Design a protein around this ligand. Structure first.
Ligand code: NA
Ligand code: NA
Lengths: 235, 244
C-alpha cells in the first residue's frame, strides 16, 4: 500500500508565497506510482496552486458540503481529486460525526477521494480512547466503497502534552482493528491511516517507520520548503 | 445613491455553464458608473468568473472568516491579496446551517473593513419573530450589532432577508418590504446620522425574479437586490434592467 503525505495549508498563503513554495515542492524527485503527495490549498488559491504544482502532486480542498459551501458536484466538475472531512478545526463550526458521515456519502457518490479525520480529547484519554475512536470511525466506515479512496487520519487532540511515536502506533493499530472488525481484514490491510498530530522534519522518521502509520496530514510544517524532507521520510 | 444589484450564485455552476452565463451578462449594456452590479460565485469558481466577466461587473465571495491567517476558512487578508472587492456576511444560510451569530457578523465586518473589502451585510427576522411583533426588535438588534463599524457608507451595503417569507408558504409584498426598509433606514439615521442613512444602500434579499423585480425596486427605500437562483439565468439581465 502506498504511503500518502498531505500538506494542509489551512488558512495561509499569498500568490507569491505559493509560487515559491510550489516551485520547491516541484524540485523533489519522487515516484507518484510509489507515493501519493496531496496539497490542500485554500479554495480561492486552488486553481493557482493546481496550475503551479506538477502532475506528480495531487490536490484537494479542505472541506466539502454535505448538500458559502463547495458542493461535491462542483468539486467533481472541476477535477478536484481530494477533500478533507472532519478536521478537528471544523469540529471544534460545530461539525458532528453525523455531518462527517453525510459529507463522506456526498463525496463518494461524486467520485471524490476523502481524507477523513478523527481522534480523542484530553479528558477522553478517562481511558475512553478506543471507545471514542470506535464511535467516530463506526459513524462513517460502512460507507467505504473502495479502501484505496478513503484515507483515515488520526488527530490526537489530547494542550501542552506531546504524543510519542509509540502512542501514535498504538492508536493506529486499534483504528485498523476497528476497520478489520467492521469491514474485513483485507479492507483494513488496504486502508491508509495517516498520523495527523504534530509532524515535523525531526519526528517524521520515527512515525513513518511505525508499522500502522502510512503517512501524514501535515499542518504548519507543510508551509515550509523543508516539507520536502517530511515527504522524503516516506520515500 | 447608485442602485446595487448582486448575483449570489450560492452552491451552483460548472465551468462551461459559467462561460455561457458570463457571456450573456457581458452582452448587457449598462453604465457601471451609474449602477453597481456584483457577482458572487462559489469560491473555487472565483478566478474563472472574474476572468470571464467584463470590468463593468464587480466580484466578491460569499463568506469570509472572522479569524485572520492561521481549516476550511478564507481570511479577509487572503481576499484582499487576491483583490476580491466584496464579501457577503450574515446571509441567512450561514446563520441557519453554520450557527453564525450577530457577534460573528460584527467580527467578520471588522476583519473585512480593516482589509479594505466592501461588504454586503444581510439580516432579517423569522416567521415566528414576525408573528410575535418582533420585526423591529430583531432588525434593530441585528443592525446595531455592526452598524457602528461602518466608515464609508458607500462601502457597506445592507440586505433585508425576509426569512418569514422564505420557504414558509408566506409571500411578502413590496409595501411590506418598503416598510421594513424604511425602518432599517431610520435605524441607521438614529445611529450614524441623516447623511449616512441616505447614502447607504439597502437591498431586498427575499425572492427576486423577473416576475417581481420592478415592483420591488420602485419602493423608495429599496436600492436593489441580492438575487439567488434567478441570477443563475441569462434573464438575470432583465432584473438588472429594472434597476437601470
Ligand atoms: Na509505516
Ligand atoms: Na427604489
Amino acid at each position: 500500500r502506498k504511503y500518502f503525505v498531505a500538506a494542509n495549508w489551512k488558512c495561509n498563503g499569498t500568490l507569491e508565497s505559493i509560487k515559491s513554495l510550489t516551485n520547491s515542492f516541484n524540485n523533489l524527485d519522487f515516484d507518484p506510482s510509489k507515493l501519493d503527495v496531496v496539497v490542500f490549498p485554500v479554495s480561492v488559491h486552488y486553481d493557482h496552486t493546481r496550475k503551479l504544482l506538477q502532475s506528480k502532486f495531487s490536490t484537494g480542498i479542505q472541506n466539502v458540503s454535505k448538500f458559502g459551501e463547495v458542493s461535491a458536484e462542483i468539486a467533481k466538475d472541476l477535477n478536484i481529486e481530494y477533500v478533507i472531512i472532519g478536521h478537528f478545526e471544523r469540529r471544534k463550526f460545530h461539525e458532528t460525526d453525523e455531518d462527517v458521515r453525510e459529507k463522506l456519502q456526498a463525496s463518494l457518490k461524486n467520485n471524490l477521494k476523502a481524507v477523513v479525520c478523527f481522534g480523542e480529547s484530553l479528558e477522553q484519554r478517562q481511558n475512553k480512547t478506543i471507545e471514542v475512536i470506535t464511535k467516530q470511525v463506526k459513524a462513517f466506515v460502512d460507507l467505504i466503497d473502495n479502501f484505496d479512496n478513503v484515507i483515515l487520519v488520526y488527530e490526537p487532540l489530547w494542550t501542552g502534552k506531546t504524543a510519542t511515536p509509540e502512542q501514535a502506533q498504538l492508536v493506529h493499530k486499534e483504528i485498523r482493528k476497528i476497520v478489520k472488525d467492521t469491514c474485513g481484514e483485507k479492507q483494513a490491510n488496504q486502508i491508509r491511516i495517516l498520523y495527523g498530530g504534530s509532524v515535523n522534519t525531526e519526528n517524521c522518521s520515527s512515525l513513518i517507520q511505525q508499522e500502522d502509520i502510512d503517512g501524514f496530514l501535515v499542518g504548519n510544517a507543510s508551509l515550509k520548503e523543508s516539507f520536502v524532507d517530511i515527504i522524503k521520510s516516506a520515500m
